[PDB]
């Protein structure tokens, strides 16, 4: 077994923005997350309940207008979207909780 191990130091989250502007590319990718808790934490379950309500979408789903999720329904009706997904990525004592989407240049503001 033997001397010098580290345990994992906690990782500071920062409210921040990275913007790789590339107009040559045909569709915009946006990912947005708040600080999740860790793997261990009991309220991961209720966050996942919530994320399921917002759901996922793709342009190859049956159901435009009739989908239960109001994000999915409006994104389909108003053509806001090629896809979106909710996520809850977990690490030890921290996470990434939010959503990723793919859309046309004139649709980012509405999607957000």
């Amino acid at each position: 077994d033997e001397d010098a191990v580290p345990t994992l130091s906690p990782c500071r989250f920062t409210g921040s923005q990275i913007c790789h502007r590339e107009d040559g590319l045909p569709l915009a990718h946006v990912a947005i997350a708040v600080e999740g808790p860790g793997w261990a934490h009991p309220d991961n379950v209720a966050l996942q309940v919530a994320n399921a309500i917002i759901g996922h979408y793709d342009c190859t789903y049956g159901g435009g207008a009739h989908l239960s999720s109001p994000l999915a329904s409006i994104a389909a009706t108003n053509k806001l979207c090629q896809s979106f997904q909710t996520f809850n990525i977990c690490y030890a004592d921290t996470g990434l909780l939010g959503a990723h989407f793919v859309c046309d240049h004139m649709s980012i503001d509405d999607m957000m």
Partner: protein, 75 residues
């Protein structure tokens, strides 16, 4: 009327930003601030100041002359 999405073409530029809640409203306010205003003053003085001094000199002459014109000494 101009709108975002329709302005111009930009390729290959990364912008990094921080939240205002993560950061200082007045970062190094005197220690970086006053060197900058000093540098700005130097950059512009020779363009701004010499007309106004030339006004001031014409002001001070013109007032002095008029005051001294409104006097006699022989009749």
């Amino acid at each position: 009327g101009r709108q975002f999405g329709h302005l111009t073409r930009v390729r290959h530029v990364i912008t990094y930003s921080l939240s205002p809640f993560e950061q200082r409203a007045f970062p190094h306010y005197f220690s970086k601030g006053i060197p900058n205003v000093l540098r700005r003053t130097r950059a512009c003085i020779l363009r701004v100041a010499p007309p106004f001094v030339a006004f001031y000199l014409v002001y001070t002459w013109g007032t002095q002359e008029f005051e001294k014109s409104k006097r006699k000494n022989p009749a």
